[PDB]
C-alpha cells in the first residue's frame, strides 16, 4: 503493497547556455512533498505538502547540502557520460535517477529501487537483490566498475532497508489524514451522439486518490480494449486524479455496454451503464 517513497532527480546540460540544471523532487505515493531546483533564485530545498512543513531547519539544511552536492556531481557525471558515448560537445543530454522503497500493507519493506537513465534510456539499475547491477551497455559498465569499487550497492541497501523505510513511516503518520485515506472515484457515464447512427459512451472517474485505477468497457461481458479510447490518468490539480474511457456504440445498443471500475477506495469493483 500500500505505500512507497520515491526521489526523482533530473540533470540537464545546455552547452553554450550556462551550467547544467539539477532538479530533485520527492514523493510519498502520488503526493509530491519536496523540491530542489539549482536554477532557483537561491537554491534551497522547499516544502510542497502540508505534512512536511513541521520539519526543523536541520532537516532543510541537510537536504539542501545533499542536493547541492548532487548538483555538482551530476554536472561531472554528464561530462563523463558524454565522453563514454563519444558524443559531440554541442548537444544537450539528460541523466535521470529514480530511487526509493516500497512498503506492503503491513508497513514492511517489499522492494528497494535505484535506477538511472541517460537520454531517456535505461543506463544502470540496482537489482532486486540490493547487491548487484544491471548495466544496459558498454558505457554503463564503466559506471558499474566505479560503483562496485566504491561499494555503492551496500550503502544503497542500508539506505533502502533503513532510513528510507524509517522516513516513509514518519511521513505516513504525519500525513495520515491525507496519505492513508483513499478517496474513491466519483463515477458516471455520459452519452454524446456522433451521428444519427452512433454515440460515444464515456465512463468518468473523478476526484480519486491514489492515481492507480482500472476503467474498462465490456459489450455483453466481452472486453472492448481494441475499441476503447482510454486517456492517461491526469491530475485535477488539488492532489486528486481523473480518468475516462470511451467507446463508440450503435444508437439503441447502449444497454449492452458496461463500464467496470477498480480502485483502492472501492471495496468491491463497480459495473455502470448509461442511465438516460
Amino acid at each position: 503493497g500500500s505505500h512507497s517513497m520515491r526521489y526523482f532527480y533530473t540533470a540537464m546540460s545546455r552547452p553554450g547556455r550556462g551550467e547544467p540544471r539539477f532538479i530533485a523532487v520527492g514523493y510519498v505515493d502520488d503526493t509530491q512533498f519536496v523540491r530542489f531546483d539549482s536554477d532557483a533564485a537561491s537554491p534551497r530545498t522547499e516544502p510542497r505538502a502540508p505534512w512536511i512543513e513541521q520539519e526543523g531547519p536541520e532537516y532543510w539544511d541537510r537536504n539542501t547540502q545533499i542536493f547541492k552536492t548532487n548538483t555538482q556531481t551530476y554536472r561531472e557525471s554528464l561530462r563523463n557520460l558524454r565522453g563514454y558515448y563519444n558524443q559531440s560537445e554541442a548537444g544537450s543530454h539528460i541523466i535521470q535517477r529514480m530511487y526509493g522503497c516500497d512498503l506492503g500493507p503491513d508497513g514492511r519493506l517489499l522492494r528497494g529501487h535505484d535506477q538511472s537513465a541517460y537520454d531517456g534510456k535505461d543506463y544502470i539499475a540496482l537489482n532486486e537483490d540490493l547487491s548487484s547491477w544491471t548495466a544496459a551497455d558498454t558505457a554503463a559498465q564503466i559506471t558499474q566498475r566505479k560503483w562496485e569499487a566504491a561499494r555503492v550497492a551496500e550503502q544503497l541497501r542500508a539506505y533502502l532497508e533503513g532510513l528510507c523505510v524509517e522516513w516513509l513511516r514518519r511521513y505516513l503518520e504525519n500525513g495520515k489524514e491525507t496519505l492513508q485515506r483513499a478517496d474513491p472515484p466519483k463515477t458516471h457515464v455520459t452519452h454524446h451522439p456522433v451521428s444519427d447512427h452512433e454515440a460515444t459512451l464515456r465512463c468518468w472517474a473523478l476526484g480519486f486518490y491514489p492515481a492507480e485505477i482500472t476503467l474498462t468497457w465490456q459489450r455483453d461481458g466481452e472486453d472492448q480494449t481494441q475499441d476503447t479510447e482510454l486517456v492517461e490518468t491526469r491530475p485535477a490539480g488539488d492532489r486528486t486524479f481523473q480518468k475516462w474511457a470511451a467507446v463508440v456504440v450503435p444508437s439503441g445498443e447502449e444497454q449492452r455496454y458496461t463500464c467496470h471500475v477498480q480502485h483502492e477506495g472501492l471495496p468491491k469493483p463497480l459495473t455502470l451503464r448509461w442511465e438516460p
Partner: peptide, 9 residues
C-alpha cells in the same frame, strides 16, 4: 528524506 550515497557516474 534523500540518501547521501553520492558518486559520480
Amino acid at each position: 528524506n534523500p540518501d547521501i550515497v553520492i558518486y559520480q557516474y
